[PDB]
Design a protein around this ligand. Structure first.
Ligand SMILES: Nc1nc2c(ncn2[C@@H]2O[C@@H]3CO[P@@]([O-])(=S)O[C@H]4[C@H](F)[C@H](n5cnc6c(N)ncnc65)O[C@@H]4CO[P@@]([O-])(=S)O[C@@H]2[C@@H]3F)c(=O)[nH]1
Lengths: 179, 179
């Protein structure tokens, strides 16, 4: 199925490649001479999973309390004929009552944005019902992959959610405080 | 299906984002003060499509006549919460009887390497027969997407092939000489 191939691709072509190297990049950042006067960037990759597939490119276009802080040092790898392909990650400050409450590596699961754009193209033969059905199935398959994964050694956190006011900052802060 | 979701993802999350900007990057390279004493890098992205899903990370581990020349200038975009995500492409020299015959932007279609790794993981429930079946279906769906695509304005060339001696350099040189 669509969700099946996408969840396995997200694992094989992304998470299994960057999760083993993520602890070191966050250590390199937290130990850099310019970040000591700020709260430490929490470990783990926080992956936003909106089941509606509403994936904006800017995280401050989802909540004002999610302000971009910096980029982690880049990861490079020779990938399918591409010499030094780049894997980049962004650090975000989380606000609670106008004050810094958490610092973390945060992004959206990129295949969710693909499922959305797919349902918009007539040639894809993919409905809005198919989009909701496949979004849930992608989140499930990902969880099942990670549950038996040796790359997931407490290196990432899946944040699945539905919008009916909603606070994305609160939803993330809730996962970060669980540690 | 698996191939369907992957072909649409490869289009939506990659080709429709980089093909409109590719002519300018190749012009910036070909017009740079350091490349004038060398043959011009041909236009179009050449995408290698091995139907066996044999995708090595190094292109010189597929043919000795395919030597890495340089990288094109990088493309950046804000992508699903990632500020300035990087899209990189590699330029290759093609040899014919130990001499430079062509210069082009060349890579493998990365989802083909995913279909291979998927069939290797028992948890994927994906066979070697499923892999051959989905590889052909990915190449077909991609061709049908591109046939009605306004991003494909003669900006890329699909090179599908099967291995039974074989020359990858010759197969690429044949597509490049067609222009
Ligand atoms: N967040 C994030 N996701 C990331 C990255 N690279 C990947 N993925 C994701 O992991 C899952 C397999 O990723 P792959 O790379 S096997 O699947 C990509 C395939 F490579 C092609 N493509 C995307 N980016 C590039 C690129 N720079 N050079 C060459 N091909 C590219 O489009 C597909 C959909 O890509 P997106 O971005 S919609 O999602 C993929 C896919 F869901 C990355 O750097 N960051």
């Amino acid at each position: 199925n669509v969700a099946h191939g996408l969840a396995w691709s997200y694992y094989i072509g992304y998470l299994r490649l960057i999760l083993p190297e993520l602890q070191a990049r966050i250590r390199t950042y937290n130990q850099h001479y310019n970040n000591l006067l700020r709260g430490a960037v929490s470990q783990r990759l926080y992956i936003l999973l909106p089941l509606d597939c509403g994936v904006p490119d800017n995280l401050s276009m989802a909540d004002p309390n999610i302000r971009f802080l910096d980029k982690l040092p880049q990861q490079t790898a020779d990938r399918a004929g591409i010499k030094d392909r780049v894997y980049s990650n962004s650090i975000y400050e989380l606000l609670e009552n106008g004050q810094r409450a958490g610092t973390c590596v945060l992004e959206y699961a990129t295949p969710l944005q693909t499922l959305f754009a797919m349902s918009q193209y007539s040639q894809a033969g993919f409905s809005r019902e198919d989009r909701l059905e496949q979004a849930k199935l992608f989140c499930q398959t990902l969880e099942d992959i990670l549950a038996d994964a040796p790359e997931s050694q407490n290196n990432c956190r899946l944040i699945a959610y539905q919008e009916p006011s909603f606070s994305l900052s609160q939803e993330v802060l809730r996962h970060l405080r669980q540690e």
